[PDB]
Amino acid sequence: WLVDLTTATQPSVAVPRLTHADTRGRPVDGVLVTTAAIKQRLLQSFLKVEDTEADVPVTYGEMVLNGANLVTALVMGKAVRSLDDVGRHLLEMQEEQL
């Protein structure tokens, strides 16, 4: 019956940056979560604990930002340079994201 749980789910799309693993380094494919009343039961007769300490990532993730970059720029005087600053402040701003 346990073997049915494990095989009922089709694997998922995501591939994580790091992978929870053994001491040996073998990867870990998923998580049973039960009450403790059952866990005690299973660990006697129906299973064996083949590792004790596991390796787990620490840092969270972050995101890469490619956004819509908008401007509202105060302006004093109207000329090409003052206007080209718009084009300039764009590049300045898009230069910042990278």
Binding site: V80, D84, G87, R88, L90, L91, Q94
Partner: protein
């Protein structure tokens, strides 16, 4: 880098020229005063709209 190139053209591009067109001051406002049936619709059976 590509987008900079485009800003480099409109920076370096020829800006404005000198053209004959009638400019009338009405109120305080300047105006192009224009009738196109010469420069365009002349000698073409397209009716002047």
């Amino acid at each position: 880098e590509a987008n900079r190139e485009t800003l480099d053209e409109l920076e370096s591009a020829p800006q404005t020229t000198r053209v004959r067109a009638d400019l009338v001051a009405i109120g305080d406002r300047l105006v192009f005063l224009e009738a196109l049936e010469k420069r365009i619709y002349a000698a073409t059976n397209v009716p002047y709209p």
